[PDB]
């Protein structure tokens, strides 16, 4: 059962940081996450990923996770990529605790009876998702008018950006999310 | 004066990580990019992500940065990225030691009679970044004819995923590039 | 409440069919699908469409109904419509007896690890969604191969078709899908 | 000269209803539509489509003739049906009277010269035929104003979908329309 | 009455050179062109336009006037250009003396039963009109197993330019087409 | 050193006129633009062509040549035609005096810093280039709002049309620019 386009590598082949993460996931969630293996390929570059990611996505910040998490699916559904989508999906009806909104929104946000905030957020996502070349000044000013300041925005644009980042790793090699995630928080 | 949507923070409402990245901007290449003011609006996740852009783009990896700055060109040009663009159009324009070449690759590398390789690289850079969708495992063949090997591909598809996300944040923010750039190595 | 944007007619306002229809699926099912409700507003017209889209999806004919449901999963997701996507995905964890398959189905069929025969479905319900005017005869030749003859062919491209008409009925009109869906053969 | 990318059924090959409308056909218009043989292959579902079809387009509900003859030429020339293009064409100068307004709609509806209603008309039917996934209530605003009730909508959201199924139905399978349809009505 | 979305000039706002033409067009088709007036707003551009086109199109060339007004056909029917569209249709079923073969590549040439030189012309004059960024020398290869020579390529390369010059300023500027135009060689 | 995909005519087998292009070209800027020997293939349509564009672009009329040269890049970027870009950039850059704006412009006019009316030409040139079906008499307006009268409507609308036939031609045949334009006004 592949869960990558290129070799994995194994516990012999990279460095403690990752052993480490591999070892945590399991004792805290059950499982280890493909993409920690799959990605582990070149070690250094993918524990300055993990570095970056999870401060971001998973430490605190300026947005919430449910808005993060928002975000991660609607890009993720966008760019239709299959392990973000999954493992994302499920960390959504985990926040949000309503996994038929969740569901909704994986498919389109315009139909998933979101509040306004979360509308602006989805529809900003959705557009500097497809139409990077076109967004300008006046997009932030939605953003503005439903409450986010300027920490928020730099956040929500580096979420929306990181999900454009691993959408792209993720679909060049086949990464295959855990049988867990399609289960979790249903 | 602006370059930034955003406010850009002073000496005194960064870190002293940013502050030092400045100091070493300074003496090294002779100004402190645009990108590292605007940029440090939120300290740590700045400073997380120059952790991993810099190892992944500037330090040695598995591809050669005259390979890294060809992808950074093809993408930002393809998003239409203005700070992007113009930074590493400089930087390509160096690491081939050829202005017209650089130049070419900005508008339109099907006509910027490439080596085999190249083509390569610029043609899966292109397709990642406007057909996420669509890419899949018979994309690498081309890749392996060339010679890239499976550190190679993992460093490429993360440098697309990459500037896939400083293309949307450097524009979402609208990011202006210092001068300097757009003078150098020509 | 809502599960339209238009006014939903009540038992008094549909013709005799259809609240005979509402009992026989409430019998079936458990409930009445919201699309019964909605999408009597016009009577005559909506039990048309019932008789003809009851053969083609649910009644024996040329193609399994996996196979069907596998091209509604996958239409209903390129055009992003949440009634169809929900209640067909439902559709299609039943059939398969495989809820992780069909939801990955429903984000990218190219990464769902499908037979042969399913990707050359898939991969055509996708390009006569996306890519109408550009179909040729040239592209049944591959369903040929994975062993469609006339009659599947001919069942085939009304699936498609029926999946570009309820994806547009149900997004133009703010179809809600019921809360079971969301639920069944998880 | 083939009428199909399939196989054409004969008389001994079809169920009654389908020689019963050929027979229609011959003694009312002088020919038997092309779409009547060739996508007769299988019978039942045949029927079942021509009784919605005939129901929505040819016989009396809340929509005129020149109406929604207007929307199947705007459809079919976004699509580029060439059998449903030709054959609606025909249809559209017989209702209007008016042979290059109806050739004009075909080419483009905003050049068309056409009445307010008739470009809101024209304008919704090729946005959901292009951006399904972009619709939302906010579109029916527009239908609303110049003045389409609850029924006519419902009649209008079928048609486009109707066409969206039939062009690809048509194209898919290469239909042919009779040669009578591109000289009626001029 | 509007024939554009500029005012039109009359005899006495034009150069004597158009005037002439006028005359020229009146005498030897039995009207003067609507195109001769609306975009003779520049006077002196008009006449180096029309010295152009005329030759291009009109005059002796490499290519048969069949084979220009096919292509112009083609990338007009892309573009939905109703000026382009209506006249050149006019030409190209005076040209093969089929209205509805002519009619029938306005639509979709894939579905016009065209011959293998023609479809090759037809195929590149849609390529080239709708991803010019994407032509490649490849790209001739296939003109050339029709016959073209290099004389015959670079004249058909003008003609999809000028089409997508004229569709251009034609749709901008809102040129209607003469009604005799809808009514010649059916 | 390739200029063209096809076969470039020497001086014997050009008319006068294209000989004596090259002889003022030669003398007055030190080179001769490629274009003028590459596209010399067909003679005669050559020197018509040239004759036209000529007219539009370097003589004087109703915009300045900064406007123009503006609108020559914003399309070209847009087509990402090489021989255009390069060749028009160097234009710009003299016109504006300003190398980095017209760089800037290149990339992506929306993050330029242009005035207003350089931003509705730019805005429109775009449009017109990339959804010519769109344009509509309503997007007329913004052009007068910042001044153009009819006259210069009239050609900006063949500017952009102009540059649209030009990137097609040279894209297809792949022209090479000329070194010195990637040096020249920096």
Redesign the interface.
Known sequence: DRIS???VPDATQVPEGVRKLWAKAEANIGFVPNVFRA?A??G??FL??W??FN??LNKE??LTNAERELVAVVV??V?????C??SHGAALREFLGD??KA??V???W???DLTEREQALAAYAEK??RH??????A??EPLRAVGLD??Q???L??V???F??????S????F?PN?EY??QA?
Do not use: F
Request: proline share 6%; net charge negative; glycine share 6%.
């Open positions: 386009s290129l070799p990605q390929v070149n250094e570059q300055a990923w570095n970056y401060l971001l910040g300026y993720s559904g760019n239709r990529c299959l392990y989508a999954v996994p038929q569901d909704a994986a498919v389109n315009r139909h998933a500097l998702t990077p070349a076109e967004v300008t000044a997009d932030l300027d920490h925005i730099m956040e644009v580096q929306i950006g990181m454009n980042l691993t959408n792209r790793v679909s060049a090699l086949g295959v049988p399609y289960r249903r």
